[PDB]
Amino acid sequence: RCNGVLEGIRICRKGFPSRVLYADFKQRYRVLNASAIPEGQFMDSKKASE
């Protein structure tokens, strides 16, 4: 607490902590709406995840 560690986590969590790289995003989650998420990821590495 006194370190700043817990305060850096706070400030993080306000922002957007976890940030996924797009391919790293495709592969792992395509399966969720498999048809429409796979198409997206393949069709545009980025546009896909979108």
Binding site: R30, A34, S35, A36, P38, E39, F42
Partner: protein
């Protein structure tokens, strides 16, 4: 429900080789597929065992057990989505055209997951793959879903 489809009972008389109106437990997987149901073989296996039914020892059947097992498999037909079948094979080969190289689909269908014999794999590629060694899976999955 009947909609009472009495043609399921008439098809049981076409698969029972003894004519006694019983169908062995080893035929129930293939006859659920012939009535318009595609349960995976592990699912057919589980359900069986789930009910303390051993497919290892002699089996008989009665229509009164085969009817409710077909009705328990009939809810799982919502898993048959063709978007995921064509997108599976679209992730299996590069470039923007739906072609699997011959031996890639034959070795994957025989050795990956539920083992399909290479005799059945050759009977499913016969006609859709020409001598270029490239299977167009847009028409291949269309013809596989025509039966």
């Amino acid at each position: 429900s009947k909609a009472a489809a009495d043609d399921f009972k008439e098809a049981f008389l076409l698969f029972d080789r003894t004519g006694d109106a019983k169908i062995t437990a080893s035929q129930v997987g293939d006859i659920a597929r012939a009535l318009g149901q595609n349960p995976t073989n592990a699912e057919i296996n589980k359900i069986l065992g789930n009910p303390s039914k051993e497919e290892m020892n002699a089996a008989a059947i009665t229509f009164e057990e085969f009817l409710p097992m077909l009705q328990a498999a009939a809810n799982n037909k919502d898993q048959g989505t063709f978007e995921d079948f064509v997108e599976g094979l679209r992730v299996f080969d590069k470039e923007g055209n739906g072609t699997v190289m011959g031996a890639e689909l034959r070795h994957v269908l025989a050795t990956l997951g539920e083992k399909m014999t290479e005799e059945e794999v050759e009977e499913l590629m016969k006609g859709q793959e020409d001598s270029n060694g490239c299977i167009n899976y847009e028409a291949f999955v269309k013809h596989i879903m025509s039966v």
